[PDB]
Structure formats: structure tokens, C-alpha cells
């Protein structure tokens, strides 16, 4: 029975901010050793900040990576520790995890996500990628749907038409310069399904809107 909770992250523009709030309910916050560790997406776990407790004077060390820029601090009870990234330099961008320690063990957060860009809530242009100078085509036809230059992060692809069991493989979106680019495909049948149909169905809650692109 133990909880670490990373309370509040998000968007922030190359530059000068975000104070992060972790909360650990189910141990003597008091007597522990608390810290913040990260692993941007296309990043591995790296270790960021640590502070201790009474017996240790609440020592605090902070890694080079963000030493003198970042800061870790703590308040007992429904004890909330806090990192303070007033100074975000985008490579600082991943999930930031909160963690307890004690004798030898420790538990981790669910983590709070941090994305940082100068970009602006944009919308994706969506294109329909038709089996065009290819062979699988004829036997087995794959069609992709490209959805680009949207922002931020949460767009939804979805398929349609033709009519059966087909092989959709839609890849993790990636961050292009300052906006995301995504794609999807279906290996669907020859002409049977070709001749019937297939519609690419895309949407961004994230604001703007949901568009449809249709193969052919």
C-alpha cells in the first residue's frame, strides 16, 4: 500500500518555467529520500533531483543535466515533493517520475508528462496514400493514410470500407521540427476489396477537427 503522484505537467515553450508537484501517501513522507527521474519518450531513464530528510538535513543534490537550473524540495504530511523547471530547455522533455526510497527499496510514480515547444495548437493536413506503383497492390493491396503538421499529440486514425479482416499497422507519431506527423496502413485484398472500398477516418479532439480522406 503506497502512492507517488506526479501532479501537473504539460505544454511549455522553450524557456522559463513549470513547477511540478508529486505527492506520496502511504509511508512516513517525513523519514524518506525523495526524488525525480525522467525518460523522455525517445529517451531512457536518467536521474534528475534528490532531497533527503531530517537526519540528513534534507540534503539536496541535483544532477548536472539540470543542476543549478532545476529544483527539488519537499513538504511533509500528505507530503508533496516538487521539482521546479523554471528554465525548461526542451530536451528536458519526457515523463518526469517521482520516487520514494527507504533502506534499500523504492517506488515510482505513474509519472507526469512534459512536452515543450514554441509551436501552437495547429491542425493536421491528412492525405490518402493509394497503392500507386506497387506490386503487393495487385495481389495484396496496402494503402497508407498520412496525417501531418498537426499539434498537439492526441490525434486519432481509424479505418473503413472495402469489407473484411485486414492488416492495419499505424505507427507512433513523431515530432517533426515543431509538430507531429503520423501514418497508417491496411494490407487489404487485391481488387475484391479494392473494388468495394476503404476510407481513412482521422480526428483531433485536441482542437481543430476530424477529417476524412478516402482512397480513390
Amino acid at each position: 500500500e503506497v502512492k507517488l503522484d506526479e501532479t501537473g505537467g504539460g505544454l511549455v515553450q522553450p524557456g522559463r518555467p513549470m513547477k511540478l508537484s508529486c505527492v506520496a501517501s502511504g509511508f512516513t513522507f517525513s523519514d524518506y529520500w525523495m526524488n525525480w527521474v525522467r525518460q523522455s519518450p525517445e529517451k531512457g531513464l536518467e536521474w534528475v533531483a534528490q532531497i533527503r530528510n531530517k537526519p540528513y538535513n534534507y540534503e539536496t543534490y541535483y544532477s548536472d543535466s539540470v543542476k543549478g537550473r532545476f529544483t527539488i524540495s519537499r513538504d511533509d504530511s500528505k507530503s508533496s515533493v516538487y521539482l521546479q523547471m523554471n528554465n525548461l530547455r526542451v530536451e528536458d522533455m519526457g515523463i518526469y517520475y517521482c520516487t520514494g526510497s527507504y533502506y534499500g527499496m523504492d517506488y515510482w510514480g505513474q509519472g507526469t508528462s512534459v512536452t515543450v515547444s514554441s509551436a501552437k495548437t495547429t491542425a493536421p493536413s491528412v492525405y490518402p496514400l493509394a497503392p500507386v506503383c506497387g506490386d503487393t497492390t495487385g495481389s495484396s493491396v496496402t494503402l497508407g493514410c498520412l496525417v501531418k503538421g498537426y499539434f498537439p499529440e492526441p490525434v486519432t486514425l481509424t479505418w473503413n470500407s472495402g469489407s473484411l479482416s485486414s492488416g492495419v499497422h499505424t505507427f507512433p507519431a513523431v515530432l517533426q521540427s515543431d509538430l507531429y506527423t503520423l501514418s497508417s496502413s491496411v494490407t487489404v485484398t487485391s481488387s475484391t476489396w479494392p473494388s468495394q472500398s476503404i476510407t481513412c477516418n482521422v480526428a483531433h479532439p485536441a482542437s481543430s477537427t476530424k477529417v476524412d480522406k478516402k482512397i480513390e
Binding site: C133, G144, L146, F171
Partner: protein, 219 residues
């Protein structure tokens, strides 16, 4: 920082098999008191990285029995003595003896199959794209194994462009295959400037390069 590394970086095994994932270090994580500070993390998808083992030998509550921690000083090993799929994930070895505290690259547990060579598939710019002044041709290597491929793009027989958005997806459902989409983005200007577009990729199963091609003029 202590160089805390892992061997291998990936691990293809099968549900019944067993693994030794290797972590070794900069110096012996043997602290004074409490002593050896080195932990073992399992991380499953979109998930927090739980730990299975602490201070080498200590297995942590719930951590299933099939799990063990060997080691001494600068050398460590964790062992699945039989991989249920639940065990599927990245395994990291961290050290809490020597500030700054460290995670190794992780070591990815994988179903070990046969199954495949990529079905490359190519796709020329869309009319609307073009009439967007934008032009990106696309390549998909679908359903391959083992993971390692390499994609390349060739304009007019001898290109290299910068404009590539490579995206990747591991499978953890049926066929145990991994797929890859790659994207060349250009101006409508460069697009109507070349004609011979090519997507050439080298793989395990390969021998010779796997290429797909199309021609502004014809394909």
C-alpha cells in the same frame, strides 16, 4: 557517474525459456553500510518501471518467484528461469550506491519467432499535397523479423535527403513482427525537380538490398 551497462540490448526467447540479463558497472556498487546498491526494473508499455529486485539479492513483494538476482560488486545478473509473456518488457539495472544513480540502457524481452522480411511498399505525393506546395513520398516495410532493417532514399539514383520521418512499431499480439514507415518530405519545387524516387533498405534476411521505386515520369 558510474558507467552501468547491460548485455544483451534485446533478448529474443520464447515462453518457457529462461534469461540471464547482464548488468555490469563502473566500480563495485558496494556501499559501506546497507552496501551493494543496485536495483532491477521491469517496464511495460506506457507504464511506470516497477522494480523486481533491490540490493542485488532482495526480491520485492509480489515480484514473481521466477525472478532472481545474482551479482557481486561490479557484476550482476537477473534471471527469469522461465518467461511467461507477462514478463514481456524492458529490463533495467539501476544503482543507488554511487550518486548520480543510474539506469542501464535496458534490455528488451522479445518473443523469438521466424516470420519475416519486410513487404516494402512505396507511395508518391498526393495531388492535394502537391497543391499544398508540399511533397512527401512514403515507404512501408510491413511485418519483419528480426527487428533490424535500414531504410534509405535515392533521388535520381544518387540522393540522401534530410527530410525523413522514420516511425517504428514493435508487435506484442499475434505474429511477433515489427513494422516501419519512412517519409521523405520535400517542396513541390524539388518534387517536380526530380523524377526517379527510390526507397532502398537492407535487412537480416536480405543478402542484397530491398528497394522499392517509382518515377515522377513513370511508375
Amino acid at each position: 557517474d558510474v558507467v552501468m551497462t547491460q548485455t544483451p540490448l534485446s533478448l529474443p526467447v520464447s515462453l518457457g525459456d529462461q534469461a540471464s540479463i547482464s548488468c555490469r558497472s563502473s566500480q563495485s556498487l558496494v556501499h559501506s553500510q546497507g552496501n551493494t546498491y543496485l536495483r532491477w526494473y521491469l517496464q511495460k508499455p506506457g507504464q511506470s518501471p516497477k522494480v523486481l529486485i533491490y540490493k542485488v539479492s532482495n526480491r520485492f513483494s509480489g515480484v514473481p518467484d521466477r525472478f532472481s538476482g545474482s551479482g557481486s560488486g561490479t557484476d550482476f545478473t537477473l534471471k527469469i528461469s522461465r518467461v511467461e509473456a507477462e514478463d514481456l518488457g524492458v529490463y533495467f539495472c539501476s544503482q543507488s550506491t554511487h550518486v548520480p544513480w543510474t539506469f542501464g540502457g535496458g534490455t528488451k524481452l522479445e518473443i523469438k519467432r521466424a516470420d519475416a522480411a519486410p513487404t516494402v511498399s512505396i507511395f508518391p505525393p498526393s495531388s492535394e499535397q502537391l497543391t499544398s506546395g508540399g511533397a512527401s513520398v512514403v515507404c512501408f516495410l510491413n511485418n519483419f523479423y528480426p527487428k533490424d532493417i535500414n531504410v534509405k532514399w535515392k533521388i535520381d539514383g544518387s540522393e540522401r535527403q534530410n527530410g525523413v520521418l522514420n516511425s517504428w512499431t514493435d508487435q506484442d499480439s499475434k505474429d511477433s513482427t515489427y513494422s516501419m514507415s519512412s517519409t521523405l518530405t520535400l517542396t513541390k519545387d524539388e518534387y517536380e525537380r526530380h523524377n526517379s524516387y527510390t526507397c532502398e533498405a537492407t535487412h537480416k534476411t536480405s543478402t542484397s538490398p530491398i528497394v522499392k521505386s517509382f518515377n515522377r515520369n513513370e511508375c
